[PDB]
């Protein structure tokens, strides 16, 4: 049964077992297809299945100080479905 995908071309050992046919990249993105143990895969790329460690969100440092406050000067009314 199918001798392609036995190949050494794109092979990546993961804690989820052995992944074949996906290009491992040093970048991070939001999870598209979940593989497991922090790894996800996507077509985002002349285009290929990539595999990556997922990003959890944009990193942010709050401008905290013992005498600084931020106050809103406007608002948005928003409507959201559940």
């Amino acid at each position: 049964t199918w001798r392609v995908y036995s190949t050494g071309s794109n092979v990546f050992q993961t804690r989820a077992g052995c992944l074949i046919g996906a290009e491992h990249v040093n970048n991070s993105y939001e999870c598209d297809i979940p593989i497991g143990a922090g790894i996800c895969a996507s077509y985002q790329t002349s285009q290929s299945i990539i595999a990556y460690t997922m990003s959890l969100g944009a990193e942010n440092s709050v401008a905290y100080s013992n005498n600084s406050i931020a106050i809103p000067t406007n608002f948005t009314i928003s409507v959201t479905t559940e």
Binding site: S68, I77, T80, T81
Partner: protein, 224 residues
């Protein structure tokens, strides 16, 4: 009021075209129940180790005494198929019951009220919610206030004036870099610091951060 009404009317338009573009939670309970019935029906054609899965082709073929042991295998496998289906329906019904209890309390607390429970009635501060009917479900449109366009200010716990520590009644003390004001906390609206938007407690020594601004008194200017 015009701006708030336009933001609301615009946001309803976004819902309307987003639904015109999903209802995956309502669809997947329909899919699960259809798949379970389709499986229950398909079990009938399996043999369970009998010579066939068709009762008449047992009965028209065998003597009754040998038919009994062939039939008894079909009884057993069918009974087990049915019993499996009913058990999974009981478990899935308990999940729908939990979802209906959530929807019922969500209607009392978000539609018949205004909720202070964070994230219970959508993201941001809850204003109100509207129900819409859906097949085997409900949709809530939650309306919320989201604060926008922050500015930085310097701030202080208290003002020291006449050797007394003054605290804001509702707001916070803020400075634009040269002047001090008191503002409500969720929307910048600076006002003159006075005896009438502050209260006093003790002298200036105990509070960790405290600043020497004046406090105005609106009953001082009168001459008689």
């Amino acid at each position: 009021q015009k701006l708030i009404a336009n933001q609301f009317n615009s946001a309803i338009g976004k819902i309307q075209d987003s639904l015109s573009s999903a209802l995956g939670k309502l669809q997947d309970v329909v899919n699960q129940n259809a798949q379970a019935l389709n499986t229950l029906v398909k079990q009938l054609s399996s043999n369970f180790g009998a010579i066939s899965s068709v009762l008449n082709d047992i009965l028209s073929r065998l003597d009754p005494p040998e038919a009994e042991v062939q039939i008894d295998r079909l009884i057993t496998g069918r009974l087990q198929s049915l019993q499996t289906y009913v058990t999974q329906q009981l478990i899935r019904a308990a999940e729908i019951r939990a979802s209906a209890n959530l929807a019922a309390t969500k209607m009392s607390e978000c539609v018949l009220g205004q909720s202070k429970r964070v994230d219970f009635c959508g993201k941001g501060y809850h204003l109100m919610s509207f129900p819409q009917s859906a097949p085997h479900g409900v949709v809530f449109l939650h309306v919320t206030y989201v604060p926008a366009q922050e500015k930085n200010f310097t701030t202080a716990p208290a003002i020291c004036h006449d050797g007394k520590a003054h605290f804001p009644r509702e707001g916070v003390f803020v400075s634009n870099g040269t002047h001090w004001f008191v503002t409500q906390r969720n929307f910048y609206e600076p006002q003159i610091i006075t005896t009438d938007n502050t209260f006093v407690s003790g002298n200036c020594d105990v509070v960790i951060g405290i600043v020497n601004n004046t406090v105005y008194d609106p009953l001082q200017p009168e001459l008689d």
